[model samples]
Target: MSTEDAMTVLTPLTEKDYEGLKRVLRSLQAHKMAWPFLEPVDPNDAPDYYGVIKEPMDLATMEERVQRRYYEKLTEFVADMTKIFDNCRYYNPSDSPFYQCAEVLESFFVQKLKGFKASRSH
Candidate 1:
C-alpha cells in the first residue's frame, strides 16, 4: 500500500474527520464576525497585540494547516482553534468588538465541534 494510505490507516482520525474539520472551518470563515480572525493580526494595526498574545493564531493559518494535514490528532486542531479565541480575549477587552466576536464564534465552534465528535462515535 502507499505510504499515505498506510498513514491514514494508522492515524486515529480518518479522512472524514479531516473533512468535517474543514467544513467547520468553512462555516466559521463564512461568519460575519469572522473578519477579525480571518487573517493574522497586523502588527501595524494593533501595535500591542503581539506583546499581549505570545502565541498568535488565526483562522487562515489554521485552514492552511488543515490543508497541509499538519494535525495528527483532533486535540491538536482544537488547541489551535481555542488559541484564536484565547488570544482575542486576552488582547482585547470584554466590551471590545473583537472580544465579542470571539465569544460568539467560540460558542458556535464549540457546538459544531461537539456535533463532529458525536458523529465520530458512530
Candidate 2:
C-alpha cells in the first residue's frame, strides 16, 4: 500500500536502443521485400495483384486456392514478425514485460504505415 511498493521504474529507449530497433526494421523490410508495398503504391507493381485466376476455364473451384494462398502468406509474414520480436526480447530485457516493448514497436510502425491510407472518421 506504500508509495514505494506501488511505484515501478521504467526506462525509456536510448539512442542505442533506437539504432538497434532501426536495424531490425531495416533487415525485416528487406527480408520481406517490403519496399514495393510501402507507400506510393505503384500501378506497375506485379506483387500488388491478388486476384484469383479464372482464365482459360473460369472455374469457381479456384476460389479456395486464392484463400489458401492468402492464409499461407499471412502466416508466413506473422512468423517473420514474431521472429523480429523474439530477437528484440533477447537483446533487450526490460523491467516491464518484453511484449510491451515489442507491441509498441509493432504499433508504431503499423500506425505510421496504415495512417497514410486510413480514413479518419473520428
Candidate 3:
C-alpha cells in the first residue's frame, strides 16, 4: 500500500469526546500562554510545531482523490473522540456521506491544530 494509504490516523474518537480533546487543547493553550515566561523563545513566538512535527506525521503521499477510502477512518475517529470529550456528539449515521465528510473534516482540523499547538511546549 502507498504511504498515505497506510497512514494510521489518531485513534477513532467519539464525537462526544470533546472534553478529552478540549483538555489537551487547554493544556497546550496554557503552555502557549506561559512559554515565553518560562524559557523565552525567539521572535515568531508562534513557533514552528507543524513544520517539524506535522511533516513527519500528517504528510499525504497518495494522490488526492474525490472519493477517499480513508474518509471512514477519519470520520469514525472524530466521532469517537468527540463522544469521549463532549459526552455526546451524534452525527446522523444516515446523513449524506458528503455531510459526514465535512463534519469529520472539522474534527480532524481540531485534532491537528491542538497537536500543532502542543508540540512546542514539550
Candidate 4:
C-alpha cells in the first residue's frame, strides 16, 4: 500500500461566501446548484476534524458546468476549476471531506482576490 500524506488544516467559510459563488452562476446564466439536492446555505458549521458542508469541490464542479455553456470565457474557467478540484480531493479531510473541499474553494477565492485582505491568517 502507498503511504499517506501529512495532515493539513482547512478553514471553514461563511454562507455569504457560498452565495457569492452562486451569484456568479446567475450572472453566467448557469444553474446555481449542481443537482436537485444542493442548497444555497449550509445551515451548519464545520466539525472539529473538518466541517459539515453541502457543496464540495466535486459538486461545485457540477454546478460550474451549468453555466459554462453560456459563458464565453468559460474555457479557462473550466480548466482552472478542474485543477482546483483535483487539489481539493487530495487535500480533503476524511472526517469531513465536503467541508474540506469548501475550505479549499473559500481559500481559493478569499486568498486570490486582488484587493481585499483576509481577516485571519490560515
Candidate 5:
C-alpha cells in the first residue's frame, strides 16, 4: 500500500499493545525469562518468513488503500516480529537480544506514534 494508506491501516498502538511490548522487553532484559531462539536467517533468504515484503517494498510509493488491504500484512509483520525477536535471542546473553530488541521496538513504536501524533496535530 501507499504511505498514506499504510498510515491509516495501522491505527496507533493501544495501551495494551504498548504495555505488553514493554513487558515482553522488560522480561527479556532481566534474563529472568528466555524467549524462543532461532538463528538469524537473512530476510532476503525468507522474505515471506518476516512478512516485511509482499508485492514489493514500496510502501512510500503505494497509493491510498483501505485498512483491509494492509491489515493482513501488518498483522503478519508484527506476528513474525515476535519470532524475529525470539530467534535473535539465540546468539549470546552478551548479545543481549532481550534488551536490544526491547529498546529497538520500543523506540520504533514510540517514534511511530509520535509521527502519527504530529500528523494529526493540526
Candidate 6:
C-alpha cells in the first residue's frame, strides 16, 4: 500500500547521473562518425527515412531531453540513445557508411555508459 514511496522510487535522474550522461553525450556528438546522428534525418534528403524510422532519435534530441529532464530512468535514456544507432542500421545497408558509423558509435556509447555506471557505485 506504499504507493507514495513507489512513486518516489521512479523519480528522474539525480544531478550526478545528469552530469555524467551529458559528458557521454558530448563525447558522442564530437565523435567523427557522429555526423550522421548529430541531427534528425532530413525528409527531403532521404524521403524514405521517416517511413522506415518511425521513432527518430539523434544526439541533439538526447541532449535536449537531458536538459529538459525528460528521462524518468537511466534505462529510458539509454533506450533513446540506442534508438539513434538502431534507426540508422535499420534504414541503411550493413556495408554503408551510415550503418558502420552507427555500429562504431553504438559500441563507444556502450563502453562509455558502462564506465559511467561503474563510477557511480564507487
State every prediction's TM-score relative to the real structure. Answer: 0.88, 0.26, 0.23, 0.23, 0.27, 0.88
Query: Which stretches of model 2 miss by more than 4 angstroms?
Result: 1-72, 95-101, 109-122
- Predicted model with the maximum lDDT: 1
Overall lDDT per candidate, in order of appearance: 0.86, 0.35, 0.34, 0.36, 0.39, 0.84
TM-score (C-alpha, index-matched) for candidate 1: 0.88
How many clashing pairs does model 6 include?
0
- Residue 63 in model 3: lDDT: 12
Predicted structure 5, TM vs. truth:
0.27
Residue range 1-122, candidate 6, lDDT tens digits? 24323332464668877898899999999999999999888899787887778899988899899999898777788889989988888888899999999999999998998777666545
Model 2: per-residue Cα lDDT at residue 32: 35
- Extract clashing residue pairs from model 2: none
Clash count of each predicted structure: 0, 0, 25, 2, 2, 0
Clashing pairs in 6: none
Tens digits of per-residue lDDT, candidate 3, 1-122, equal 23322333533333433333445434433442222222222336334533433211111111111123333343443443343223111222336442344355446547664553343223
- After superposing candidate 3 on the true structure, give the runs of residues whose Cα lies further than 4 Å from its correct spot: 1-94
Pitting candidate 4 against candidate 5, the one with the higher lDDT is: 5
| 2 or 6, greater by lDDT | 6
Q: What are the RMSDs of all candidates, in order?
A: 6.2, 18.5, 19.1, 15.5, 12.9, 5.1
The runs of at least 3 residues in candidate 4 whose Cα sits more than 4 Å from the true structure, single-residue gaps closed, are 1-22, 25-72, 93-95, 98-122
Ranking by lDDT: 1, 6, 5, 4, 2, 3
Better of 1 and 3 by lDDT: 1
Q: Write the per-residue lDDT of candidate 1 for residues 37-101, one digit (tens) a residue.
A: 99999999898878878899999999999999888877788889999999999888889999999
Task: Name the lDDT of candidate 1.
Answer: 0.86
Q: List the residue pairs that clash in candidate 1.
A: none
